[PDB]
Structures are given as structure tokens and as C-alpha cells.
Write a protein that binds this ligand. Sequence first.
Ligand SMILES: Nc1ncnc2c1ncn2[C@@H]1O[C@@H](COP(=O)(O)O)[C@@H]2O[B@-]3(OCc4ccc([C@H](O)c5ccccc5)cc43)O[C@H]21
Length: 183
Amino acid sequence: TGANVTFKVKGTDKEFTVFTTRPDTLFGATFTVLAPEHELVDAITSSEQAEAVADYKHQASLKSDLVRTDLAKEKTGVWTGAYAINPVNGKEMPIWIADYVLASYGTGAVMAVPAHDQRDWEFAKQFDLPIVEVLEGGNVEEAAYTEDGLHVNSDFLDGLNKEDAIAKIVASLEEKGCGQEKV
Ligand SMILES: Nc1ncnc2c1ncn2[C@@H]1O[C@@H](COP(=O)(O)O)[C@@H]2O[B@-]3(OCc4ccc([C@H](O)c5ccccc5)cc43)O[C@H]21
């Protein structure tokens, strides 16, 4: 039981969809990550970033799934040169490629929530990216908080728990056709 969320690419007519198990953390998504092998990558990569993106894709194709999803391995990646638009508030989120996202699982794209996902937190720490708390109970600057808590910094989701918030955001994204529940 997860959800699909669709993001527009700024300044283009392109879109991608991510698979998320925590659509309730949408207001804490500070960047997005595509698998280096994702089909959209070449289309949205800027000319300044083209060669670095090509180099990283080659490096990534030489690593197995197991090696890539290994928690202990240093996070790596490169900015595509593009930005995604958060449907709930129009906020820009830089689009990165990174090998800890796998092409074959879900859609091959994620929304990164460094405050509440360990791998995303490690990436943000490696690359000096913003970390935004959306569930209280932890100290997200020092460690990802992966448990239940009341929602904050999340507009209409404020004060709800995981169950209630997921139900509300999913129902709200469906209304707009920016997302739906998915198995
Ligand atoms: N292709 C992909 N490669 C790597 N990671 C991917 C991926 N596609 C989706 N993801 C990330 O993992 C899925 C779910 O994994 P699962 O099916 O094993 O439960 C995630 O949904 B996530 O979207 C935003 C989010 C916030 C917080 C978490 C966090 O780890 C969490 C998740 C559940 C309970 C408590 C904490 C996970 C995600 O990151 C995605």
C-alpha cells in the first residue's frame, strides 16, 4: 500500500511519477532523485550538466543492485540541471540522479524526504541539501526520524498522525489527478 505522485519539470512540458510509501511527508520533500537509467534523464539534463550526467550513468551501470542499495556505501550523484514542481505548493525541488535509486523498482524515481528517510538523509548530508521536519518526535538535523508523530510544516495536514495524514493527502491528490493510491 503506497502511492504515486506526479511532478512537473519546470520550464518544460515533461512529467515524472514517483512511488512513495509516505505521501504524507510531501511538504518535507526538498529534492527529487531519478535512477541514472530513468528514461526522462537525457531529455531534462541541461547542456552544462550533460557530460557529468553521462559520466555518472556509466559509473552507475558498473554497480550491481546490491552494491547500490547498501546503506554503508558513500552516497554519490549529480544534478541534472532541472527542477521538479511540488503539486501542493508549487515549490521547486532540484532533480538529481543518484545510484541509490534503482531503475526497476516502483517508477525508478523518488521524492527525497531527508528528515524522515535514512538514505535521503545521508544524501542531503553529503550534498549540503535542506532537511525539513514534517513529523515531530526527533531531532532531524542529527538523525532521520522514521517513526510516527504529529505533522508540522505541512499546511492542511498539521496536527494529524500518519494514518490520518496519508488518507487526507492521498484523497486530496486524487481530486487533482496529481496522485492516487498504488500497490
Ligand atoms: N526505485 C527506488 N529505488 C530506491 N528507493 C525507492 C525506489 N522507489 C521508491 N523508493 C523509496 O522506498 C519507498 C518505499 O519502499 P518500500 O516499498 O520497500 O517500503 C519509498 O517511499 B519513500 O517516499 C518518501 C519517503 C519518506 C520516508 C520514508 C521512510 O523510509 C519510511 C517509510 C515507511 C515508514 C517509516 C519511514 C520512505 C519514503 O521513499 C521511497
